[PDB]
Structure 1
């Protein structure tokens, strides 16, 4: 992550991120709504950061330092460039909504009143089709990636030294290769939990309550489609094992 965004999302909540004299100007219901929107953006910033660890630290480091056989790095990190493009674009829209809402003279005081429209746009049309295709592929290649990683770590000394070297810093404690893969798979099922809680505190403007209700429905339709499109790939699986599913 870049320092500007890390500092803007360093606090545990929106109520602790804004100036106390700005917080005091708002009703409790607005504070509860903004705390959950802040959690959605903060966790999206961390999710994009997980994808940058996968592309820049692991994937590119293996290509630039190791002698792995062709197609090994793609098997360890399936769809990572596509996932990074989807989420970096979504994060850019969330951060621009926050930035446009800042008070003049402030880099931290803002209220986002219209999140629903942004979520409907993300979870409909081509961007939703791309999310569905990419997660159906990623989640079907998840078990294969974990097994490929375990095999390389157990048999290749240079691969083992590379992993231990780049995961040694304390800031990587939660972000080893297998942990990143599971963090990405679990991201999509966090959205309904966050959207439902934002909706619980967005009844003040009927247009907003309706837009978040529509967005929650689109997210659930996407998850149902992804879940129906998963069949775990296994290295060396025979056709007979597949057609006898």
Structure 2
């Protein structure tokens, strides 16, 4: 992540991020809505950072330092460039909505009143089709990536030294290779939980309540489609194991 966004999302909540004199101007219901929108953006920033660790630190480092057989790095990090493009674009839109809402003279005081339309756009049309295609592919390659990682760590000395080197810093404690894969697979199922709680505190404007209700339905439709489109790939799988249960 870049320092400007890390500092903007350093606080544990929106109520602790804004100036106390600005917080005191809002009703409790507005504060509750903004605290959940802030958690959605803060966790999206961290999710994009997980994808950057996968691409910039692990994938790039292996291509630059190690002598792996072709197709091995793509096997460890399936779809990571496509996932990075999807979420960096979504994060850019969330951060632009926040930046437009800032009060003049402030870099921290804002209220986002119109999130629903941005969520409908993200979870409909071509961007939803790309999210469905990419997660159906990623989640079907999840088991294979974990098994390939375990095999390389146990048999290749230069690989084990590389992993121990790049994962040594305390800031990577929660972000080993297997941990990044599961953080990415679990991201999509956090969206309904966050949207439903934002919706609970968005009844003040009926158009906003309707837009968040539409967005929640679209996110659940995407999750149902991804879940129905998964079957784990396995290295050395025989056709007979595939067409039999």
CA distance in 2, matches of 1:94, 1:205: 20
Cα deviation per residue 1:208-239 (whole Å; 9 max; x = unaligned)? 00000000000000000000000000000100
Q: Secondary structure at the match of 1:237?
A: coil
Aligned partners of 1:109, 1:141: CA distance in 2, in Å? Answer: 42
Unpaired stretches in structure 1, ≥5 consecutive residues? none
Partners of 1:61 and 1:93 in 2: how far apart? 30
CA distances 1:71-100 after superposition (whole Å, capped 9, x unpaired):
000000000000000000000000000000
The secondary structure found in structure 1 opposite 2:213 is: helix
SS across alignment from 1:212: helix
Q: Distance in 2 between matches of 1:101 and 1:117?
A: 15
Supply the distance in 2 between the matched residues of 1:134 and 1:214 (Cα, whole angstroms): 23
Q: Could you tell me how far 1:46 is from its partner in structure 2?
A: 0.1
TM-score normalised by the chain length of structure 2: 1.00
Q: Distance in 2 between matches of 1:22 and 1:65?
A: 50
| 2:145 aligned partner | 145
Q: What does the per-residue CA deviation read over 1:40-66, in whole Å, with 9 as the maximum and x for residues that have no partner?
A: 000000000000000000000000000
Q: Deviations over 1:92-141 (max 9, x none)?
A: 00000000000000000000000000000000000000000000000000
Distance in 2, Cα, partners of 1:31 & 1:138? 37
**How many residues align structurally?**
245
Pairing 1:104–2:90 present: no
Given the two structures, how large is their TM-score scaled by the length of structure 1? 1.00
Q: Secondary structure at the match of 2:236?
A: coil
The alignment partner of 2:88 has SS state of: helix
